[PDB]
Amino acid sequence: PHRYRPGTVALREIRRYQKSTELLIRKLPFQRLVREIAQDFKTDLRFQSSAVMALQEASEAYLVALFEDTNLCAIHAKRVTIMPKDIQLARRIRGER
Amino acid sequence: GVMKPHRYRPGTVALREIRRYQKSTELLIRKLPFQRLVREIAQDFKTDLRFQSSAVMALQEASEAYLVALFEDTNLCAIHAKRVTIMPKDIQLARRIRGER
Amino acid sequence: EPDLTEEALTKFENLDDCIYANKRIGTFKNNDFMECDCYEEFSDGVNHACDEDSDCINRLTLIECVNDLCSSCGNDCQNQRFQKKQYAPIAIFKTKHKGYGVRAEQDIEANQFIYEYKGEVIEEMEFRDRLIDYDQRHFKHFYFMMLQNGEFIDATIKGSLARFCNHSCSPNAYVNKWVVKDKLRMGIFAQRKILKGEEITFDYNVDRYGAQAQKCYCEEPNCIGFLG
Amino acid sequence: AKTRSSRAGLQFPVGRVHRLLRKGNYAERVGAGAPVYLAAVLEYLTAEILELAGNAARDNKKTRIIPRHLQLAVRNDEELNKLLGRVTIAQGGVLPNIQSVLLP
Amino acid sequence: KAKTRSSRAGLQFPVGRVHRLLRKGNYAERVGAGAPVYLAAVLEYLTAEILELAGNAARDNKKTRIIPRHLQLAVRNDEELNKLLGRVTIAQGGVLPNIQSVLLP
Amino acid sequence: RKESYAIYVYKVLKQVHPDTGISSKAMSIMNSFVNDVFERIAGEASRLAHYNKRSTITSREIQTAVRLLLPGELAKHAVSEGTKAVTKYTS
Amino acid sequence: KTRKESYAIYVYKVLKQVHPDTGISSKAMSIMNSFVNDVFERIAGEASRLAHYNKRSTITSREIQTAVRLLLPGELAKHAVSEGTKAVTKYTS
Amino acid sequence: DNIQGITKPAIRRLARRGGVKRISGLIYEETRGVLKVFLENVIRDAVTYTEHAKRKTVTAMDVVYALKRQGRTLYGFG
Amino acid sequence: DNIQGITKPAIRRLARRGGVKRISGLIYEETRGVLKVFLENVIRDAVTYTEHAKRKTVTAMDVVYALKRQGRTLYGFG
DNA sequence: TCGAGAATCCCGGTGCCGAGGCCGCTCAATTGGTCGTAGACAGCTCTAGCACCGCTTAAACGCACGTACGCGCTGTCCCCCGCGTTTTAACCGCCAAGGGGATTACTCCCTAGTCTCCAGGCACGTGTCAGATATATACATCCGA
DNA sequence: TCGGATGTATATATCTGACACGTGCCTGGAGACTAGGGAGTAATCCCCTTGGCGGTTAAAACGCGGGGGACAGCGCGTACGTGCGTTTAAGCGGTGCTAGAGCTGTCTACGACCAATTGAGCGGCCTCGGCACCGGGATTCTCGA
Ligand SMILES: C[S@@+](CC[C@H](N)C(=O)[O-])C[C@H]1O[C@@H](n2cnc3c(N)ncnc32)[C@H](O)[C@@H]1O
Ligand SMILES: [Zn+2]
Ligand SMILES: [Zn+2]
Ligand SMILES: [Zn+2]
């Protein structure tokens, strides 16, 4: 009957994934997603091994840079929980949609 | 005496001015204090300069659009904060999300 | 009895259009006709475009809608309550000690137009002489109204039916201002649901400076005793 | 002496565009169909901008195109607002809009 | 003998390669003589300025080789290098450790 | 002398809307627009010609620059009008 | 096959001069090469724009100095201009 | 249907790297939509460069040029 | 003190153009600071172009080129 | 105000693969000389920029008044987090076919450069209708006497 | 009733206004001709891409208790709205002077260009050391008492 208060494991994961630098999205589902949404532009394509890695690094950096501003919007709204209106605000101030 | 029954509620004249300055397209800052400000901040970079008129007009037309876009994004921040009044923390949030600071 | 209305039509001079002592009078200083944004037009039946519980920016900004200038809206609107003179049934009845107070005829709901205050428009340099001769001729009441910082509204000789209403410290009516083709016109709405047989009163907030301090006969538990 | 623009069937000039491609130091060699193609693209874009500006001018009963009409014609289209995203047009103003949480 | 312009100007980055890239980059018709020397000096100063902070981070994290994590830390811990490389994603670098003050108890 | 595009915008305007005019400030805005779009397409075509180790800007390079710079619906009509103009010129 | 030119050995010499005992991997060297190429293209494009605006044909050291002054922020631009001026002065005499 | 391959514990790890303490339940579909739009734009530009190059293999340099047009400037790949 | 020339009913007028209904009292000094930082960042590049062009007058094309470097293309002065 | 319990770092042994050094080989940087033209400098013109001054009047400021909303506080309920169990496909290792990217050689035809001819757009004067403006007299419209 | 002063405004005849048309011209665009070098095309080689299959387990999926934060409502009071008189300096004309932008000539020096040379830098092949990985013990933070 040993349990932690909710938040401690969350801060531990924040420290762990801000210390470690590695891939977070798995390689084969991301590669299948890239190939599936690449079938809509040209049939019978061919991909290298490093292009998928470059796409995954760019997507990871874009998503982390989005969630940082989203968390800042959630803090400015006097909340801790992130709602998708914070995502919409962070993408609308930046100039995307 | 003269009875005085009328007084405008706060908000009606404000929305009327919003419609007025969203319909009209003109200069909103006075020209000579803006020119004195530009010359004073340009004295610190190079002594004994000289300006045209179209350069100062280009500076003013840039500053107008910059400040109007800043107040639009700041009003969006204040609406997201479940308020109507704009605070300077909304300005700081807009400048930090935009990438200026 | 409604015969007092027919007597009052013989007392003063009733009018239907606004008159002025000068053509250049103090009006709204920015004339470019801010129009609305509603595109609805029910021209076959009844125009339900500019009505309450809607998004009419001219109604929310207190701006009259003009027929031959407001495009993409229609030809007739329910916001047009001054040019069409969509008035209320009125009956001038007697009071105890106030005089001839206007008492309501039927049930008037909240935020509903009753009758437009009309009359002459006078200049302050002429208003000084009007105050002097109306004071020395010893008239029983005063029938004036503030329009701007230097322009007043007279309704003694040439007035309307809204010049009779008395003062009370627990009112059921309020007065707004409207811009009707570069004209500042008055108007009396309703605060609450006015029932049958109730005298329609409103706050004067008069700032008098003469040699007479009148009294009030409202006798409600919110009064003071003086007039401003 | 037929002009090259009359041979191409366009209204924008072609030899001026070829001279600007040879002058601006973009490459060592310039082809023959590139100024015709680029003049056609510029003519189509200019015709689209002037068509929407004429529509915005007829929407206010005017006989002359003003930068306010240019601002409205750019900002009321989806693709032209994406093309001219961070471009400021002088004496143009902004689009009239009022938020829904501000109305009483 | 036959000296080089890099040894003549006292620099470590090459001068003939930069001059060839200026002549073949389609920037102008004519290229001066002091411009590749000046640009090689600027590039050498920027390379030394970033490798100083990279080596300081590698010494402070008790390592020897410089990895993209140390490059990311050396760029993002400086002010003017972060202002210069503001729209640059460095691969295998990660982010800075930063927890907001309203989240931790 | 001073080169501009002030008469060609007149020629396009008299074909798209005959009963109208245009001022001088709007003409300056249109000239700045034509110059900006010209410089962006020329720079994109120069980079596309440099990336393939070639020294010649062709209609294929300009078409690739148009498809990279303009959005979805507008670039298709631009490619169609440009291909029609090249076909009429080579016919 | 085909010779591939890179800035690896020169950044390695700068690293061995600025630190006596410090190594570097291949990925960090690729990032350094891409950084040198990016700053080279930025300064060369800005100098080309400066030479085109003034109706010139020759890119001298003045256009490179003005491009460095426009592109590098604050204190770094002053030291870059000083080191480049020292290098041009040493190359002249 | 490979957009569901971006699992729930992966967006959670991306948020923990971003610094998020608590995540709601409507974040994941919006995150998948944003990722889909961004990847469609970058893959559209990369396939445009590949079709211009008259090839069939999408190299890493096409991806670097597609990110350079967007303003990303990825270092480390060519 | 020419920064006080940006008066109180001018920032309010800019906010009324921007669609602002109600304004606090700590907005004006922040707006003056933002305008001063932006104008210094543009005037520095304009004076740099003027010093490079061997002139002593700051023309409009230098301002247009500075705004082009800032990422804000201005039409109507070229 | 603290002891079980779970992470977390220090230290030591194993080990393995990749940064660095060495050597051979093409090739582009270097040096020398010739030659074509880019702009450095001096000079002349003339034009907007700066400075000053008088007049008018529209915008800013200080103060009075008030009322509407920002924020502190309390309840509540619901939904996301920590933990345990079950499933499942990702990572790795391995082999096999093959298809297109890079290279080399050959051939061709497209465009830069040159010369001559000529006509088209840029200034430079004229002409507009929209928007007003100097006499003046009918049509009323009042102000003494 | 009689004498005297006045707003409106079209008949007649005039003063800006920013754009919309007849000519002079000269400088840039168009028509042949030649040479050569960039570009198109066929063949070859291999090496990187794609596809299949088996074993293992880290990680994804699924329930379940609960507790802490998002959301709804109430009350306080202050601070930012509207208005009025006062003050202040922003427009708006007119004149004067001049530093400095803009346009021409001379020709000196600085970079383009080609041939020979050789030291400089890219590529293949060891090699030993620094960081990857695992086991044991001491250290540090958590949470119900
Ligand atoms: C309805 S009108 C005149 C009333 C009545 N018809 C008369 O002839 O006296 C408004 C006037 O009534 C007067 N009045 C208003 N409230 C009053 C009151 N409570 N008691 C007595 N007179 C009042 C005001 O002075 C105002 O001038
Ligand atoms: Zn309406
Ligand atoms: Zn209406
Ligand atoms: Zn009373």
Residue numbers in the entry:
A (entry chain E): 38 to 134
B (entry chain A): 34 to 134
C (entry chain K): 33 to 260
D (entry chain G): 14 to 117
E (entry chain C): 13 to 117
F (entry chain H): 30 to 120
G (entry chain D): 28 to 120
H (entry chain F), I (entry chain B): 24 to 101
Task: Show me the paper's own sentences about this structure.
Tri-methylation of histone H3 on lysine 36 (H3K36me3), primarily deposited by histone methyltransferase (HMT) SETD2 in mammalian cells, occurs at gene bodies of active chromatin and serves as one of the essential histone marks associated with active transcription. Substitution of lysine 36 with methionine in histone H3.3 (H3.3K36M) is an oncogenic mutation that inhibits SETD2-mediated histone H3K36 tri-methylation in tumors. Set2 is the sole H3K36 methyltransferase that carries out mono-, di- and tri-methylation of H3K36 in yeast. The cryo-EM structures of human SETD2 and its yeast homolog Set2 complexed with the H3K36M nucleosome also provide an evolutionarily conserved structural framework for the recognition of nucleosome by the histone H3K36 methyltransferases.
To understand the structural basis for nucleosome recognition by yeast Set2 and the underlying mechanism that determines the activity difference between yeast Set2 and human SETD2, we solved the cryo-EM structure of full-length yeast Set2 complexed with an H3K36M mutant Xenopus laevis nucleosome (hereafter, xNCPH3K36M) at an overall resolution of 3.3 Å. Nucleosome DNA unwrapping at SHL-6 and SHL-7 as well as the specific interaction between the α-N helix of histone H3 and the AWS domain of Set2 serve as the evolutionarily conserved structural features for the nucleosome binding by Set2 from yeast to human. Structural comparison at the active sites of yeast Set2 and human SETD2 revealed that the side chain of the K36M mutation sticks into a hydrophobic pocket of Set2 (composed of residues Tyr149, Phe174, Met177, Phe234, and Tyr236) that is mostly conserved with that of human SETD2. However, a remarkable difference in the side-chain conformations of Phe174Set2 and its counterpart Tyr1604SETD2 was observed between the two structures. Mutagenesis analysis revealed that substitution of Phe174Set2 with Tyrosine (F174Y) severely impaired the mono-, di- and tri-methylation of H3K36 and a Phenylalanine-to-Alanine substitution (F174A) completely abolished the activities of Set2, suggesting an essential role of Phe174 in the recognition of H3K36 in yeast Set2. As human SETD2 and yeast Set2 have the identical residues (Tyr149Set2/Tyr1579SETD2, Phe234Set2/Phe1664SETD2) at the two positions, the Phe174Set2/Tyr1604SETD2 pair identified in this study might serve as another type of ‘Phe/Tyr switch’ that accounts for the different methyltransferase activities between human SETD2 and yeast Set2. In addition, EMSA assays demonstrated that lack of the SRI domain severely impaired the formation of the Set2–xNCPH3K36M complex, suggesting that Set2SRI is involved in nucleosome binding. However, Set2SRI is not visible in the cryo-EM density map of the yeast Set2–xNCPH3K36M complex, which implies that Set2SRI might interact with nucleosome in a nonspecific way.
